[PDB]
């Protein structure tokens, strides 16, 4: 409102979306670790070697998305700081 | 774009991030705690603290 009024609000929406993306990222991670818990029960005690390799690979990509969206959120807060 | 600050919300996200890097290792202790809900319980608590601190920060930011 104080550093360009009508546009700064038209920029809170963007910050809004960035927070939503982070929250979603953190939820997708927990979701993936719940899914791992169920996958292991399905195996009825057989080796989970292959499940662990898949989880490791998938978790690394989920962690890359999280960092990228965290980076973007920091950069947006910084501008808002002095619209 | 260069570096950021030491804000309460960045420290919270820090702890979430360090916890997840430990999980990534899939060590024996990670495997134990994954088959319980212990890991998802600890991550949910860290997630909630991050979003709580983030709301608070944006609120005080609008004062400037």
DSSP-assigned letters across all residues of B4-33:
----HHHHHHHHHHHHHHHHHT--HHHHHH
CB A38 within 8 A of CB B36: no
Of B4, B43, B61, the CB nearest to A30: B43
Residue B59 in 3-state DSSP?
helix
Tokens standing for A63? 């962690």
Query: Solved by what technique?
Result: X-ray
Separation of alpha carbons B4 and B40, rounded Å: 28
Of B13, B31, B40, the CB nearest to A30: B40
At B35, give phi and psi (nearest 5°).
-80, -20
Residue B39 lies in domain: 1-64
Look at chain B and report how many structural domains it folds into. Answer: 1
């Amino acid at each position: 409102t104080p550093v360009a009024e009508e546009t700064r609000a038209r920029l809170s929406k963007e910050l809004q979306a960035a927070q939503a993306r982070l929250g979603a990222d953190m939820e997708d991670v927990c979701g993936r670790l719940v899914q791992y818990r169920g996958e292991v029960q399905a195996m009825l005690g057989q080796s989970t070697e292959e499940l662990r390799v898949r989880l490791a690979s998938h978790l690394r990509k989920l962690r890359k998305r999280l960092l990228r969206d965290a980076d973007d959120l920091q950069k947006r807060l910084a501008v808002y700081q002095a619209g | 774009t260069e570096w950021q600050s030491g804000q309460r919300w960045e420290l919270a996200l820090g702890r979430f991030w360090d916890y997840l890097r430990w999980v990534q290792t899939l060590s024996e202790q990670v495997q134990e705690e994954l088959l319980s809900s212990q890991v998802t319980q600890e991550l949910r608590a860290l997630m909630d603290e991050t979003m709580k601190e983030l709301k608070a920060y944006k609120s005080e930011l609008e004062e400037q």
